[PDB]
Scaffold this motif. Sequence first.
Motif, PDB file in Angstrom:
ATOM      1  N   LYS A  70      46.173  37.467  31.009  1.00 40.62           N
ATOM      2  CA  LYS A  70      45.364  38.260  31.999  1.00 40.62           C
ATOM      3  C   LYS A  70      45.028  39.613  31.300  1.00 40.62           C
ATOM      4  CE  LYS A  70      46.439  36.848  34.843  1.00 40.62           C
ATOM      5  NZ  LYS A  70      46.363  36.471  36.430  1.00 40.62           N
ATOM      6  N   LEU A  71      45.108  39.455  30.157  1.00 39.34           N
ATOM      7  CA  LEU A  71      44.695  41.284  29.053  1.00 39.34           C
ATOM      8  C   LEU A  71      43.167  40.975  28.908  1.00 39.34           C
ATOM      9  CD1 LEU A  71      46.250  43.949  28.916  1.00 39.34           C
ATOM     10  CD2 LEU A  71      46.486  43.201  26.486  1.00 39.34           C
ATOM     11  N   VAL A  72      43.008  40.561  28.509  1.00 38.42           N
ATOM     12  CA  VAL A  72      41.373  40.404  27.861  1.00 38.42           C
ATOM     13  C   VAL A  72      40.350  39.505  28.611  1.00 38.42           C
ATOM     14  CG1 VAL A  72      41.500  37.391  26.618  1.00 38.42           C
ATOM     15  CG2 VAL A  72      39.965  39.050  25.118  1.00 38.42           C
ATOM     16  N   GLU A  73      40.833  39.176  29.840  1.00 39.26           N
ATOM     17  CA  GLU A  73      40.329  38.648  30.850  1.00 39.26           C
ATOM     18  C   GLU A  73      39.970  40.146  31.722  1.00 39.26           C
ATOM     19  OE1 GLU A  73      38.029  36.933  32.466  1.00 39.26           O
ATOM     20  OE2 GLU A  73      38.637  34.939  31.127  1.00 39.26           O
ATOM     21  N   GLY A  74      40.761  40.936  32.126  1.00 42.09           N
ATOM     22  CA  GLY A  74      40.656  42.317  32.587  1.00 42.09           C
ATOM     23  C   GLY A  74      39.025  42.978  31.373  1.00 42.09           C
ATOM     24  N   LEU A  75      39.715  43.031  30.305  1.00 36.49           N
ATOM     25  CA  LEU A  75      38.971  44.116  29.144  1.00 36.49           C
ATOM     26  C   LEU A  75      37.339  43.445  30.049  1.00 36.49           C
ATOM     27  CD1 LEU A  75      39.585  46.280  27.951  1.00 36.49           C
ATOM     28  CD2 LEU A  75      41.781  45.014  28.766  1.00 36.49           C
ATOM     29  N   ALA A  76      37.241  41.998  29.549  1.00 38.07           N
ATOM     30  CA  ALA A  76      35.509  41.508  29.524  1.00 38.07           C
ATOM     31  C   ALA A  76      35.251  41.165  31.051  1.00 38.07           C
ATOM     32  CB  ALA A  76      35.711  40.515  28.730  1.00 38.07           C
ATOM     33  N   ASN A  77      35.896  41.830  32.404  1.00 38.60           N
ATOM     34  CA  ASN A  77      35.209  41.749  33.420  1.00 38.60           C
ATOM     35  C   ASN A  77      35.493  43.196  33.977  1.00 38.60           C
ATOM     36  OD1 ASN A  77      35.570  39.239  34.108  1.00 38.60           O
ATOM     37  ND2 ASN A  77      37.590  38.853  34.087  1.00 38.60           N
TER      38      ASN A  77
END
Length: 121
Positions: free
Chosen positions: A51-58
Amino acid sequence: TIEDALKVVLRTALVHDGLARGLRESTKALTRGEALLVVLVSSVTEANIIKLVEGLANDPENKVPLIKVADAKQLGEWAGLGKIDREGNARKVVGASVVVVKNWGAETDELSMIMEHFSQQ
RNA sequence: CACCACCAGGAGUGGAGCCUGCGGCUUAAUUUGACUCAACACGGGGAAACUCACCAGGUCCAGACACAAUAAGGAUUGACA
Ligand SMILES: [Mg+2]
Ligand SMILES: [Mg+2]
Ligand SMILES: [Mg+2]
Ligand SMILES: [Mg+2]
């Protein structure tokens, strides 16, 4: 050679000091304009690194590179974690989950090859 | 043979007050070497700190290199009040 050449774009990236390897490091790094290509595991456990790194790179602006690959223990040897022993078999290393890249140390045709697969299929 | 011996002498030291070195006593420590000539204003030693070795306390690693372990979902480092 079907999209497992991401090792060689990472390996020339490491020699010009351009891998913010590590969940803490990557998250700090890609929360600025440093995010140039990102590599993620499919899932290690408990779904929240996912979840976490995907939301920052989205984010809602242009900075959305993202590449989705297999388990972490391979990936550390795909990055630079030293287990050479001058090419000896010994793996003294661990596996990272998220590698974010800056500046990719290169002019590679595989670097030319890789974004097009990221862009067109 | 020789003023590191005497002769004929000169200037002394030993007495005094201080300066300095050694032994002793004392001390937490009063760091130590050197005891006739050939130790004792000697270690160029006139030490407030440093020198410094002694005493009372507080940091640091400045423990190379190798092999194991640990460990990028953090091996470890630094700090404001
Ligand atoms: Mg006298
Ligand atoms: Mg002396
Ligand atoms: Mg003396
Ligand atoms: Mg000492």
